[PDB]
Amino acid sequence: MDVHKKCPLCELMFPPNYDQSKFEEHVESHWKVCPMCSEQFPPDYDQQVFERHVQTHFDQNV
Ligand SMILES: [Cl-]
Ligand SMILES: [Zn+2]
Ligand SMILES: [Zn+2]
């Protein structure tokens, strides 16, 4: 019966003909983003681990 595109990260759903690219754009909008290098992560990626990534850009001296 699945007549819609399910977002995998939230509860939303879309017309089955919903602009693929716009849908990719939706999905991307949940991702966490490193403010220095822009790497992206699952929204639920561990916050400690995530912060450690950011910090490393500094600790390292880029
Ligand atoms: Cl740590
Ligand atoms: Zn979503
Ligand atoms: Zn980064």
Note whether 4 and 14 are within 8 A (CB).
yes
Q: Which helix (H) or strand (E) is 2 found in, with range?
A: none
Q: Specify the experimental method.
A: X-ray
Distance CA 2, CA 49 (A): 36
What share of residues in the chain are helix, strand, coil (percent, to 5)? 35, 15, 50
Protein residues with C-beta less than 5 angstroms from the ion ligand 3: 34, 36-37, 39
Residue 55 Cα to ligand 1 middle (Å):
9
What's 1-62's CATH class? special
- The amino acid at 36: M
Q: How many helices (H) and strands (E) does the chain have?
A: 2, 4
Tokens of residue 34, six digits: 């490193």
Residue with tokens 């220095």: 36
CB 4 within 8 A of CB 13: yes
At what resolution in Å was this solved? 2.8
What is the Å distance from ligand 1's center to 49 Cα? Answer: 8
Question: How many Cβ atoms from other residues are within 10 Å of residue 36's Cβ?
Answer: 13
Domain boundaries, the chain: 1-62
Q: Which two tokens stand for residue 52?
A: 């450690």
Rounded-to-integer distance, Cα 62 and Cα 54, Å: 11
